[PDB]
Scaffold this active site. Structure first.
Site, mmCIF file in Angstrom:
data_model
loop_
_atom_site.group_PDB
_atom_site.id
_atom_site.type_symbol
_atom_site.label_atom_id
_atom_site.label_comp_id
_atom_site.label_asym_id
_atom_site.label_seq_id
_atom_site.Cartn_x
_atom_site.Cartn_y
_atom_site.Cartn_z
ATOM 1 C CG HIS A 114 61.429 29.446 68.124
ATOM 2 N ND1 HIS A 114 61.411 30.713 67.692
ATOM 3 C CD2 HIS A 114 62.836 29.035 67.866
ATOM 4 C CE1 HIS A 114 62.529 31.270 67.416
ATOM 5 N NE2 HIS A 114 63.397 30.111 67.450
ATOM 6 C CG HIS A 115 57.211 22.474 68.913
ATOM 7 N ND1 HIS A 115 57.276 21.592 69.922
ATOM 8 C CD2 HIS A 115 55.899 22.085 68.395
ATOM 9 C CE1 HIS A 115 56.438 20.860 70.277
ATOM 10 N NE2 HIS A 115 55.321 21.245 69.456
ATOM 11 C CB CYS A 116 53.929 25.876 71.408
ATOM 12 S SG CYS A 116 52.744 24.938 70.325
#
Ligand SMILES: CC(/C=C/C(=O)NO)=C\[C@@H](C)C(=O)c1ccc(N(C)C)cc1
Ligand SMILES: CC(/C=C/C(=O)NO)=C\[C@@H](C)C(=O)c1ccc(N(C)C)cc1
Ligand SMILES: [Zn+2]
Ligand SMILES: [Zn+2]
Lengths: 372, 372
Positions: free
Chosen positions: A169-171
């Site tokens: 998942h994107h930070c």
């Protein structure tokens, strides 16, 4: 350059509520698993310590931190805190992980960094909580240890810090934190926001603003991703970073959710590809600070991080799990999300088979645009 | 008792943003589909009207409504509105559905109710937005038309109103709205909150408070639900309601997401079971006010609601879709979430095969406890 593991069994007392994806044992599982496999000595283990209020304030605001502490001690959501701080819902519920657990995981990240400065190499599997914002909880994260760690480093005098996020998942939290500065470069591979959390950020166009313009790189990837596509994306994007940023130090977030067996990602990666990715980063940038990350399948998480630990520890990866390890995993309060899956092989061998295939055109096109 | 359909093609101009599950055509699709199949006459169609500010204020607060209107006209999220009103994120984004579309869907619910009072029967496929709270957006819903409609009815003098929700997700917004009153009974079948949205409410224990204690019934159901289990649950729960509540009028929410082909539910129901459920309610309580609901598969939604409309309209369900209808569905901006699924049969025939099996023990046990 000694190799250390930062952790404690105490995390086993800070699980998320009953139905939350994070109610399963994780770091405490990792520790017991390695011990059952005789893959760690007490001397290699550094007991986690809570972060100090000062360290937390390196990134989060007083009000938010105080709210987390109050919410946890009273085990209730303070007036208006739910909407202002995004705590209390099903995503970031009230528990003893909200502050005590998170603080311990964050302090552990500062310790991993302290070891780096002392010339050692450390891994903090409890860190990598990449979603939390300056003053608000997000995506299961209450405290953003990567942000705290990075700010910690800047105050120590570092001016070129690299952050690589392999979590599926994107930070978004970390991206926002250093979106406007050129002293920090953020590189993230993740499921495209078009179909995965977070859905609002993580697109390729988000390259940074102001002095930070050009210092943020997002590599959104398609569903059903295979090992070859992941490593292809990793190698290409690393080349891009190498040509525009000479890091004095770097942090690597190693969430295990991109693995096939983890339901919270549409990536179908293997253990070995995961390890390979880890070794690729080290081949390109040398030793860095290693952090954990999202991971919701107990067996996947235990086996994957065990591979990581053996690599760093310089020890051979045993082919199979001994009986003590099998019983450990079996005794866990898990239950497969899907009735008919067959994950029996996970209780047999540590390394899973490679899960390759061709590298889809869209993946190549994405890296192509990225290079521009 | 004439049969009317409330709607308009205008909804086609109020889609949710590009990657949102609701960016697909829905009510406008329904209308064009029925027209292509020659299953509706201009005389049976009532043009949707916006709700008046007064009707909206029957449930929502001035501040929230004004925020929705301002957010839409400026096409931006007003200061602090994101956290206070939960608008602007990926779930309840800025668009022309947030107020104009929602208001039209809500006014349509009031019209459906007006027709009931005039002795007719109406269906408002745009209604059933069961998640919105008094002052906050939730689960894709900005305005809670069922709540507005129910309050509308109370002001008209009704004291015993029944609300049945067949949508695959729990109506948390509606449950909260009438949790403390005995003049409104809420019955909801849905995926257990343990694994599905909303995750915080929808449990069997939530039976109401104060005078409303005993006037709220939640029937949480397991994953992979088949047609027999759904109808079993429906029949048993209806019997429970019949024995403790004599409704003067009732509303029925008919979201199509419980269907096999819809990815936002782990229920695997068929079209025919859906229709059967609809007829079962009518056999037990007579004619009521019919509303739409969650539904994200264009073909599933078009075929399912067409079955509903034919039932009410008293016309035979044609076996297959004519060529005009096939091209309509094919021309839609859809794309199956899963590459290999094979949904070709949906472009051939209106009614899908029955999807039965045995009724699991846990389902029987749940209804058992419910009866207590
Ligand atoms: C936030 C997130 C992943 C974060 C991550 O790993 N980022 O690093 C995933 C969400 C969409 C999700 O899938 C979910 C599922 C079940 C649930 N409950 C049963 C309460 C709550 C949330
Ligand atoms: C809110 C809801 C359904 C409500 C319903 O139907 N209530 O009746 C479903 C959520 C959990 C979901 O599954 C989701 C999926 C994709 C997505 N984007 C690609 C942006 C955003 C949300
Ligand atoms: Zn993740
Ligand atoms: Zn729904």
């Amino acid at each position: 350059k000694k190799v250390k593991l930062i952790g404690t069994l105490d995390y086993g007392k800070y699980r998320y509520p009953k139905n939350h994806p994070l109610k399963i044992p994780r770091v405490s599982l990792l520790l017991r698993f390695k011990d059952a496999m005789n893959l760690i000595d007490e001397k290699e283990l550094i007991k986690s310590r809570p972060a100090t209020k000062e360290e937390l304030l390196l990134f989060h605001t007083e009000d938010y931190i105080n709210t987390l502490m109050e919410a946890e001690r009273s085990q209730s959501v303070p007036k208006g805190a739910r909407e202002k701080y995004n705590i209390g819902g099903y995503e970031n519920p009230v528990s003893y992980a909200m502050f005590t657990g998170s603080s311990l995981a964050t302090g552990s990240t500062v310790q991993a960094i302290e070891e780096f400065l002392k010339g050692n190499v450390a891994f903090n599997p409890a860190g990598g909580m990449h979603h939390a914002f300056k003053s608000r909880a997000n995506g299961f994260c209450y405290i953003n240890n990567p942000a705290v760690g990075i700010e910690y480093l800047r105050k120590k005098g570092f001016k070129r810090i690299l952050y690589i996020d392999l979590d599926a998942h994107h930070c978004d939290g970390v991206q926002e934190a250093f979106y406007d500065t050129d002293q920090v470069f953020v590189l993230s591979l993740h499921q495209s926001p078009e179909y995965a959390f977070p859905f609002e950020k993580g697109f390729l166009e988000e390259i940074g603003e102001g002095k930070g313009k050009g210092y943020n790189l997002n590599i959104p990837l398609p569903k059903g991703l295979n090992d070859n596509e992941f490593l292809f994306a990793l190698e290409k994007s690393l080349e891009i970073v190498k040509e525009v940023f000479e890091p004095e130090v770097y942090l690597l977030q190693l969430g295990t959710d991109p693995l096939l067996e983890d339901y919270l990602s549409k990536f179908n990666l293997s253990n070995v590809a995961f390890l390979k990715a880890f070794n690729i980063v080290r081949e390109v940038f040398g030793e860095g600070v290693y952090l954990g990350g999202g991971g919701y399948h107990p067996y996947a998480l235990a086996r994957a991080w065990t591979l990581i630990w053996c690599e760093l520890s310089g020890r051979e990866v045993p082919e199979k799990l001994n009986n003590k390890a099998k019983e450990l995993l079996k005794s866990i309060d898990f239950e497969e999300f899907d009735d008919e899956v067959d994950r029996s092989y996970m209780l047999e061998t540590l390394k899973d088979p490679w899960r390759g295939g061709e590298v889809r055109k869209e993946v190549k096109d994405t890296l192509e645009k990225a290079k521009a």
